[PDB]
């Protein structure tokens, strides 16, 4: 269960964002799934704090938690924002919406 | 060589003006075309905002304010000596916000022109006209007849008893203080409605009707300016011109106009225009010619006026003028006039009451106040290119059973050798075609005709082909444009024709005749449809401004498509490229167009959107989006930009129905 | 249980790093502890992918996982590395060893 | 004014050289101090690497190679004319790796000096000496006596039968091919050990013993160079100088030395040194003076040699020289000599066998080959400052019951007005103090004496105080340094004294007398302990090099503390500042010092560490770290840098026992 990027289709209405996100309806929001267990893979490029915490956890699983599989880099998406004043604010790169790479931190 | 297109009302001495244009032509070799379109004051702004327009316009000062307000008129910079050659208050009439916008030509004021034979003693007051009309109706005539369709002929009474357009004080006008609903106005207009109600006048009387009536002796009186005097002189009427009657013991106060000449900011011949106007038009001999054609009343030139005052008719015009009020030049004048007109018509025809029509006129008169002064924007700051189907003049027709189809194109470019890309697209299937082209400047042409049995007609000396054909060519004769059309028709039916100004590229599609029209008749601002699609060399002059009292830095780019002459719903493509734009830039795009225009957008950064109809993008192209109702006027759109918390209007442009548009920006 | 930085004392011998980390013996390696549940706090500055995934999880807790509390910024520490050839390689800023800020991703 | 310190062996004509220094003084006003320390060839490198050293050194060429190899000798640039004034092969003796390093002065070759009265017929072969010794022992004398402690006097035999130091070929020496363990060498050395075993010579005979023996007629023969001839001339001995005997029918091949003069690279008077050496030393009159003091044998000057050859003694020196082999100048010569010496001693005293001593000599001779040529590094490339307790000359003593304590400081700076910061620290508690200072250049002084009943003695004309005191001051007399010490002692006991060269700051602590020493006796490189701590103006000349055959770019900074004269374990502080250093820089620090030196490091970037003893840092200061055994020689440390995959040695410096050191780097 090595940390890796997996698919996650999102709908803005289900999350209550359809009000100030008019466009699109759904988009790909890849998640980071899998376990962080040493030895950690070269592609994950785990931070050494993650390695450490994983080993301490292996030593004290009840006192210290594992390293977590999370996004390490995000990408933008073109969306149509809505201001309180009521203007159709198009953001051509509304950053931090989709995952580009995953890692253990 | 060069050219000077001019607009002037058809009721003025445009022939004498044309003669002055002939002297100017012989001297400078710069041809002068004087024209008199219908409603040229309302037409000019629309075309001038597209780059296409007359080099010079002639009209009363009341409109120039609006025109230049949209940045449509170049500033006049006459030497102080020349300024001394004319009267100051005229310059004041053409001066708006500190800039001299036009050349004051003449002074116009309505006068009472009565038939001495029918009415040796014209009335001194309005209140006695009914009685007179009764008597003359017992003699088989009528007392008075004047244009009731234009409010300019009715204002003298309205303002006679205290009516006024915009309360003036402290060197400036108060637009929110209108005097149309006051007592005097309601009194005057009530009197008029009483004249019509008592059948002393017909509510449908217009300029032509009144002029015919008085000139033929059917009515004993009429109200008109100096220009009409010539037409009376041709008539057997022995006429006298005198002051207007008094209403409620007060003199009638007409709106004094100032016939002025404004230079189109989009004209490349600005220098030459200055030449003609100053050195030829405002000389003794020029005003002599024009006044010979049609009287100008009191001219703005001191010398020639000194000679014209001796005309008692001009003297009367000056009495009525002194008694009246000069027209404000502010832009709101347009709206004001519109409102007043509606009021007068609806009150004379019986549609509305005086109190109602004039209350509504008090609300409608003042409106759409200005939010900024539009100024031309340099190319390096902003740049626009586009492909449109509209043309200065155009017609499209069908030719059943015609073995040969004719296509005519009138092209006009600045005084220099230009380059042009022309491509004729073959139709689906053997018909042979004839192409007649005319040009006013040298041109290097790239002709592309594939699989077309084509024949040519042009200037062998002015046109130079990159790929010239040898046979089936014809030397174009030296005829006027209309005679060129007839001459071309003598070989075959004309399926399409268009007059383009400084085209960069031209695409002409054969067999794309739209609808069912059998004769080609040139119509201004005609929609060529699928027949023709051309890219002009020079676009509409970019404009912008700064919105005062608006915090922050927010750029506003505005695009407004002009009316499209009855076509199905179209999709307008729009590309935007903001060069040297900060990473996080707060800008907005305002796309205004007819209800039948959907927008297709393509940009590279984050910005606001504000459109009519519906709009779509390249990203998620489907799922169109409903637009909103946007103001129709330029100042309305600017005001909406202010509502959008926009402090700067980086770009402002107005185009006709066009398929594709591209905008590049700067100012870093 | 909002995501926050907490203490974590690490010993290089316990993790098997005492061989090529001679100095120090133990050091502070703050961990990121707490749950990521919407609404997400202003200081966490959660990424919108985290917000989304949290809401989808709230909708489908069995099909989609929660947002994770992890380090969003790390700091260096001075350590004494040991090369295979056998040199005392001092790294004055051996980056990515201690947590500077925590967030939900 | 200026100064020239010179070193030369005590057995040479240093008095005549000093006279040449007197002429040079009168002419240029530049005083010349000629000195003859013990083992000056082994002492020079150690001091010169610290900035303190004689302006000029005199020694055989065999050592100059090593010296300059550590970048300790400036390059000689004599005009081609002057080079023509001397013989080429001498220049070749001083030329190493293409650079002329020293001025060849004289040629030295051992000769057989026999007592004509005792031995009218000196033996032609070594094999007959035993018999002769028997006879002369029947007459109450001895046959031969010569220095056995230095291998220079035994090599002629060893090489006589084929022994050689380094196999030479193809213009270069092969260090890995040594001829000490070959047959001829073992034969010769065996013969010597047989002479000593048969009591024909005493293994403990040294230079002084042999010279006394022959000069007093106790022995009939001795082996010595031209210098000894003067001492024989004073003696009643009627001596003859002739060729050396033949061993196994082959002539004895002595190692021919070339007395040369090298210029210390750390000397600021390089120009003046060139002046003295060339224009005064290598003229007819100069070599005349020195040769008058002590014979130089065959001089390198062609003219004066042309006059000296007529001396049959010089002629003999030239025969023995031609029969021998010029010494290699390579650095390894030092190690070679050391090894050979150990061998000879251990074989003569009976400690080791011939085969064993000479095998061990074959392994020890060649060693610590060079890894690069050290060159001076400019200040802008590297900079060093430090605070040390060592001094050129120093002594510390205690003064029981002394009412007044004396402190003497000898200061010397380049030819210019300097600035100095002097601070005397009061001791815990009424004793009055006397400070005698001497200077060879003008000085602006910042004296700080708080709560000290102090008296002064100095040059009123050379010293200028920032805060001058009026009373209790004394004018310093014009005496030699020793007479200054005695004169100062005539007022009170001297508790401490030191000779500093170009000090920047000086701290003198009273009552910090270390150990139990009642008399102050100047000792070179003395450790002042807690008494004195001074910051020199000029540091040791920075040095570096490029390690060939090493891939990648890895900077190596080396620091080597010199021997410390018997002190307790000390902590040396070290600060590093690498300016314009890339983000990820691969550098290394090499800290070499005695076993009693712990290191305390302070740097700002990532780098390697390599030290002796133990080392600590500011971060996690406790928990010291055991060091490793590092090479002791400079070339050893450079070789260790090569082992560390270092391609460049950015910095190289050698200092004595110092508390604090700071290094700044450049080269971006
Ligand atoms: O009636 C509206 C009209 O009034 C004025 O137009 C006058 C013009 O001033 C005269 O020179 C002459 O042409 O008669 C016109 C009325 O028919 C205003 O100048 C114009 O703006 C306005 O539309
Ligand atoms: O014996 C070792 C010693 O040999 C040579 O020293 C000679 C020197 O060349 C002579 O000029 C004279 O001073 O006698 C010396 C021996 O006592 C080498 O020059 C020297 O390097 C080496 O240590
Ligand atoms: C052609 O007509 C245009 C439009 O009025 C004018 O600007 C230009 O100067 C004219 N050129 C020539 C050569 O007549
Ligand atoms: C262009 O055509 C007109 C009309 O045919 C002709 O009069 C004129 O001379 C032509 N141009 C030149 C340069 O001749
Ligand atoms: C002082 O002695 C030093 C050391 O030899 C020398 O460099 C300097 O030139 C001398 N200065 C004077 C003024 O004698
Ligand atoms: C410095 O002291 C010496 C010795 O007392 C003296 O001869 C010399 O003249 C002094 N300096 C000057 C500039 O007088």
- Binding partners of B (≥3 Cβ pairs within 8 A): A
* Domain match, B24 and B147 both: no
Interface test with C, best of D608, D610, D614, D646 (most C CBs within 10 A): D608
Ligand lying nearest the CA atom of residue B296 = 1
B595 in a structural domain: yes
Helical segments of B329-402, H only: 333-348, 354-365
The rounded distance, in Å, linking the Cα atoms of C64 and C55 is: 10
Ligand 3, atom 7: closest residue by C-alpha: B414
| CB neighbourhood size of B111 (10 A) | 29
- Cα dihedral value D354, D360, D365, D368, nearest 10: -170
Substitution site in B48, B441, B443 for ligand 3 pocket (most atoms within 8 Å of beta carbon): B441
Cβ partners under 8 Å of residue D386, min gap 6: D535, D536, D539, D655, D658, D660, D661, D662
> Chain B contact for A23, CB < 8 A?
yes
* Domain match, B474 and B501 both: yes
D534 in a structural domain: no
| Per-residue tokens: D315 | 């002629």
Substitution site in B62, B152, B320, B324 for ligand 1 pocket (most atoms within 8 Å of beta carbon): B152
| Strand runs labelled E in C7-68 | 9-11, 26-28, 31-33
Instruction: Provide the number of structural domains found in chain D.
Output: 4
The rounded distance, in Å, linking the Cα atoms of D177 and D182 is: 11
User: B195-204: long-range contacts at Cβ-Cβ below 8 A with a sequence spacing of 24 or more?
Assistant: B195/B129, B195/B130, B195/B133, B196/B348, B198/B130, B200/B129, B200/B130, B200/B133, B200/B142, B200/B143, B200/B144, B201/B142, B201/B144, B201/B145, B201/B148, B203/B148, B203/B348, B203/B349, B203/B350, B204/B148
* Domain match, D512 and D397 both: yes
- The minimal CB distance from C105 to the residues A49, A55, A71 is found for A71
CB B611, CB B627: distance < 8 Å: yes
The residue to which tokens 């003219």 are assigned: D303
* Structure method: X-ray
**Burial state string for D156-188 with b = 16 or more CB within 10 A and e = fewer than 16:** bbbbbbbbbbbeeeeeebebeebbbbbebbbbb
* Domain match, D157 and D243 both: yes
* Domain match, D209 and D336 both: yes
- Cα dihedral value D245, D247, D250, D256, nearest 10: -60
| Per-residue tokens: B165 | 């357009």
* Domain match, D51 and D152 both: no
How far apart are the CA of B412 and the centre of ligand 3, in A?
A: 6
Contacts of A52 in chain C (CB under 8 A): 10, 15, 17, 29, 97
Contacts of A84 in chain B (CB under 8 A): none
Dihedral pair phi/psi, residue D315, rounded to 5°:
-55, -45
Tell me, using a 6 A CB cutoff, whether residue D211 lines ligand 2.
no
The rounded distance, in Å, linking the Cα atoms of D465 and D420 is: 10
Substitution site in B60, B155, B228, B344 for ligand 1 pocket (most atoms within 8 Å of beta carbon): B60
* Domain match, D137 and D189 both: yes
CB B542, CB B384: distance < 8 Å: yes
Contacts of C88 in chain D (CB under 8 A): 608-610, 625
Helix then strand then coil, % of chain A, to nearest 5 = 10, 45, 45
Interface test with A, best of C1, C34, C52, C74 (most A CBs within 10 A): C52
| Per-residue tokens: A29 | 């929001």
| Per-residue tokens: D16 | 């005549």
CA dist list (Å): B396 to B453, B493, D310? 21, 11, 130
- Cα dihedral value D452, D455, D461, D464, nearest 10: 0
> Chain B contact for A91, CB < 8 A?
yes
Nearest by Cα to B653 from B585, B562, B567: B562
> Chain C contact for D628, CB < 8 A?
no
Measured over the CA atoms of residue A86, residue A92, residue A96 and residue A99, the dihedral's sign is positive
CA distance C92 to chain A (A): 16
B149 in a structural domain: yes
Substitution site in D35, D47, D412, D502 for ligand 5 pocket (most atoms within 8 Å of beta carbon): D412
Helical segments of D528-644, H only: 634-643
Give Cα C100 distance to the centre of its chain: 9
Contacts of C17 in chain A (CB under 8 A): 52
CB B457, CB B476: distance < 8 Å: yes
Test B610 with A92 for CB contact under 8 angstroms: no
**Burial state string for D99-121 with b = 16 or more CB within 10 A and e = fewer than 16:** ebbbbbbbbbbbbbbbbeebbee
Nearest by Cα to B506 from B445, B423, B407, B394: B423
Nearest by Cα to D153 from D387, D332, D324, D269: D324
Cβ partners under 8 Å of residue D73, min gap 6: D64, D67, D101, D102, D262, D263, D264, D265
How far apart are the CA of B412 and the centre of ligand 4, in A?
A: 15
Ligand 5, atom 9: closest residue by C-alpha: D2
DSSP D164: B
Nearest by Cα to B452 from B508, B503, B389, B493: B508
The rounded distance, in Å, linking the Cα atoms of A102 and A38 is: 16
Contacts of D603 in chain C (CB under 8 A): 90, 92
Measured over the CA atoms of residue A15, residue A21, residue A24 and residue A30, the dihedral's sign is negative
CB B373, CB B472: distance < 8 Å: no
Q: Please tell me the class of the C1-105 domain.
A: mainly beta
* Domain match, D338 and D224 both: yes
Question: Domain span at residue B127?
Answer: 111-253+332-365
Test A90 with B606 for CB contact under 8 angstroms: yes
| Per-residue tokens: B365 | 């008169």
Last residue of a domain, one of B307, B324, B341: B324
Cβ partners under 8 Å of residue D473, min gap 6: D455, D456, D457, D458, D460
Contacts of A23 in chain B (CB under 8 A): 620, 623, 625
Tell me, using a 6 A CB cutoff, whether residue D109 lines ligand 2.
no
Strands B597-602 and B614-617: parallel
HSE-up of residue B423 (Cα within 13 Å, Cβ side):
8
DSSP B126: G
CA distance A85 to chain C (A): 22
Give the pocket of ligand 5 (CB within 6 Å).
D 1-3, 5, 55, 268-269, 412-415, 440-441
D370 in a structural domain: no
D477 in a structural domain: yes
DSSP B535: E
- The minimal CB distance from B619 to the residues A25, A78, A87 is found for A78
CA distance A85 to chain B (A): 9
* Domain match, B181 and B156 both: yes
| Strand runs labelled E in B311-468 | 325-326, 375-376, 382-388, 390-396, 404-412, 418-425, 432-439, 443-449, 454-457, 463-465
Burial of A60 (0-12, 13-18, 19+ CB in 10 A): exposed
| Per-residue tokens: B471 | 């046979």
Test C15 with A70 for CB contact under 8 angstroms: no
DSSP B278: I
Give one word for B638, left, alpha or beta, with left for phi > 0 and alpha for psi -120 to 50.
alpha
> Chain C contact for A99, CB < 8 A?
yes
Q: Where are the domains of chain A?
A: 1-105
DSSP D297-335: BEESBHHHHHHHTTSHHHHHHHHHHHHSEEPP-STTHHH
Helix (H) or strand (E) holding D186: helix D183-197
Strands B443-449 and B532-536: unpaired
Tell me, using a 6 A CB cutoff, whether residue D257 lines ligand 2.
yes
Rounded to 10 deg, the angle between the D284-293 and D14-28 helix axes is 140
Beta bridge partners of D290: none
The rounded distance, in Å, linking the Cα atoms of B536 and B51 is: 10
Measured over the CA atoms of residue C40, residue C44, residue C47 and residue C49, the dihedral's sign is negative
Measured over the CA atoms of residue B329, residue B330, residue B331 and residue B334, the dihedral's sign is negative
Last residue of a domain, one of D326, D341, D356: D326
Strands D142-144 and D111-115: unpaired
Name the maximum alpha-carbon separation found in chain D.
84
The residue to which tokens 């050391």 are assigned: D338
Helix then strand then coil, % of chain D, to nearest 5 = 30, 35, 40
Q: Which atom of ligand 6 is nearest to the CA of D475?
A: 5
Give one word for D119, left, alpha or beta, with left for phi > 0 and alpha for psi -120 to 50.
beta
* Domain match, D120 and D97 both: no
The rounded distance, in Å, linking the Cα atoms of D142 and D125 is: 17
What spatial distance separates the first Cα and last Cα of chain C, rounded to whole Å?
15
CB B634, CB B561: distance < 8 Å: no
Ligand 4, atom 11: closest residue by C-alpha: B461
CB B327, CB B62: distance < 8 Å: yes
- Binding partners of C (≥3 Cβ pairs within 8 A): A, D
Nearest by Cα to B541 from B378, B404, B406: B378
| CB neighbourhood size of C63 (10 A) | 9
Q: What angle do CA B609, B614, B620 make, to 5 degrees?
A: 75
CA distance B363 to chain A (A): 29
The rounded distance, in Å, linking the Cα atoms of B49 and B40 is: 14
Q: Kindly report the length of chain D.
A: 668
CB D291, CB D275: distance < 8 Å: no
* Domain match, B72 and B157 both: no
> Chain B contact for A92, CB < 8 A?
yes
| Strand runs labelled E in D54-196 | 56-60, 95-96, 99-100, 102-108, 111-115, 142-144, 167-169, 172-174
Residue of D nearest to C24 (CA): D620
Tell me, using a 6 A CB cutoff, whether residue D9 lines ligand 2.
yes
- The minimal CB distance from B605 to the residues A22, A89, A92 is found for A92
Contacts of C21 in chain A (CB under 8 A): none
> Chain B contact for A78, CB < 8 A?
yes
Resolution rounded to one decimal, in angstroms: 4.5
CB D309, CB D318: distance < 8 Å: yes
Dihedral pair phi/psi, residue A66, rounded to 5°:
-80, 170
Name the 3-class secondary structure at C48. Answer: helix
Dihedral pair phi/psi, residue D435, rounded to 5°:
-115, 115
Alpha-carbon Rg for chain B, nearest whole angstrom, is 27
> Chain A contact for B581, CB < 8 A?
no
Name the 3-class secondary structure at B493. Answer: coil
> Chain A contact for B607, CB < 8 A?
yes
D67 in a structural domain: yes
CB B278, CB B82: distance < 8 Å: yes
Nearest by Cα to D180 from D369, D363, D360, D358: D358
| Per-residue tokens: B588 | 């907005």
Measured over the CA atoms of residue B560, residue B565, residue B571 and residue B574, the dihedral's sign is negative
Q: What is the CATH number of the domain that holds D265?
A: 3.40.190.10
Helical segments of D523-590, H only: none
The rounded distance, in Å, linking the Cα atoms of C8 and C13 is: 15
* Domain match, D180 and D246 both: yes
The rounded distance, in Å, linking the Cα atoms of D199 and D189 is: 15
């Amino acid at each position: 269960s090595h940390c890796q990027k997996t698919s996650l289709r999102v709908n803005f209405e289900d999350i209550g964002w359809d009000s100030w996100i008019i466009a699109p309806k759904e988009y790909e929001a890849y998640e980071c799934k899998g376990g962080c267990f040493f030895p950690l893979a070269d592609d994950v490029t785990p931070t050494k704090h993650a390695i450490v915490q994983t080993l301490v956890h292996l030593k004290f699983p009840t006192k210290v938690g594992k390293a977590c599989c999370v996004p390490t880099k995000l990408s933008p998406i073109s969306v149509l924002y809505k201001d309180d004043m009521g203007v159709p604010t198009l953001k051509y790169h509304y950053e931090g919406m989709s995952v580009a790479e995953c890692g253990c931190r | 060589e060069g050219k000077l297109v001019i607009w002037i009302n058809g009721d003025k001495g445009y022939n004498g003006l044309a003669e002055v244009g002939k002297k100017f032509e012989k001297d400078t070799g710069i041809k002068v075309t004087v024209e008199h379109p219908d409603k040229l004051e309302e037409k000019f702004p629309q075309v001038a905002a597209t780059g296409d327009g007359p080099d010079i316009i002639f009209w009363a000062h009341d409109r120039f304010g609006g025109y230049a307000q949209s940045g449509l008129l170049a500033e006049i910079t006459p030497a102080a000596a020349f300024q001394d050659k004319l009267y100051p208050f005229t310059w004041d009439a053409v001066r708006y916000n500190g800039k001299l916008i036009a050349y004051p030509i003449a002074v116009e004021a309505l006068s009472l022109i009565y038939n001495k034979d029918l009415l040796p003693n014209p009335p001194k007051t309005w209140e006695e006209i009914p009685a007179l009309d009764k008597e003359l109706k017992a003699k088989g005539k009528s007392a008075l007849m004047f244009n009731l369709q234009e409010p300019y002929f009715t204002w003298p009474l309205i303002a006679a008893d205290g009516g006024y357009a915009f309360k003036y004080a402290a060197g400036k006008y108060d637009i929110k203080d209108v005097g149309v609903d006051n007592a005097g106005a309601k009194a005057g207009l009530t009197f008029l409605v009483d004249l019509i109600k008592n059948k002393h006048m017909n509510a449908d009387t217009d300029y032509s009707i009144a002029e015919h009536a008085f000139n033929h002796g059917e009515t004993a009186m009429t109200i008109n300016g100096p220009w009409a005097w010539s037409n009376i002189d041709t008539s057997a009427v022995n006429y006298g011109v005198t002051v207007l009657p008094t209403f409620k013991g007060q003199p009638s106060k007409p709106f004094v106009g100032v016939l002025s000449a404004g230079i189109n900011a989009a004209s490349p011949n600005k220098e030459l225009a200055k030449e003609f106007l100053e050195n030829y038009l405002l000389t003794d001999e020029g005003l002599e010619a024009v006044n010979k054609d049609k009287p100008l009343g009191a001219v703005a030139l001191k010398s020639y006026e000194e000679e014209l005052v001796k005309d008692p008719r001009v003297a009367a015009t000056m009495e009525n003028a002194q008694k009246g009020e000069i027209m404000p030049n502010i832009p709101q004048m347009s709206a004001f006039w519109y409102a007043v007109r509606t009021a007068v018509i609806n009150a004379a025809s019986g549609r509305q009451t005086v109190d109602a029509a004039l209350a509504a006129a008090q609300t409608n008169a003042a409106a759409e106040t200005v939010h900024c002064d539009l100024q031309p924007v340099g190319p390096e700051r902003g740049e626009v290119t586009y492909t449109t189907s509209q043309v200065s003049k155009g017609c499209v027709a069908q030719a059943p059973n015609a073995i040969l189809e004719v296509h005519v194109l009138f092209l006009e470019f600045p005084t220099g050798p230009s380059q042009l890309e022309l491509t004729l697209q073959a139709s689906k299937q053997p018909r042979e075609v004839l192409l007649v082209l005319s040009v006013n400047s040298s041109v290097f042409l790239h002709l592309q005709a594939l699989g077309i049995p084509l024949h040519l007609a042009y200037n062998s000396s002015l046109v130079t082909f990159q790929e010239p054909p040898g046979v089936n060519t014809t030397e174009l004769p030296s005829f006027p444009k209309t005679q060129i059309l007839e001459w071309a028709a003598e070989r075959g039916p004309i399926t399409s024709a268009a007059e383009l100004n400084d085209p960069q590229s031209i695409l002409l599609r054969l067999g794309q005749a739209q609808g069912s029209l059998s004769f080609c008749m040139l119509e201004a601002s005609q929609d060529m449809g699928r027949t023709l699609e051309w890219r002009p060399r020079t676009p509409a002059l970019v404009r912008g401004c700064h919105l005062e009292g608006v915090a922050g830095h927010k750029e506003a780019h505005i695009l407004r498509v002009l009316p499209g002459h009855s076509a199905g719903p179209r999709t307008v493509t729009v590309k935007v490229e903001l060069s040297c734009a900060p990473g996080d830039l707060d800008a907005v795009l305002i796309l205004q167009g007819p209800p039948y225009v959907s927008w297709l957008i393509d940009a590279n950064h984050n910005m606001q959107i504000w459109t009519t109809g519906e709009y779509s993008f390249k990203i998620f192209p489907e799922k169109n989006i409903r637009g909103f109702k946007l103001p129709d006027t330029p100042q309305g759109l600017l005001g909406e930009a202010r509502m959008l918390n926009a402090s700067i209007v980086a770009s402002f442009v107005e185009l006709p129905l066009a398929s594709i548009v591209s905008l590049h920006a700067s100012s870093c």
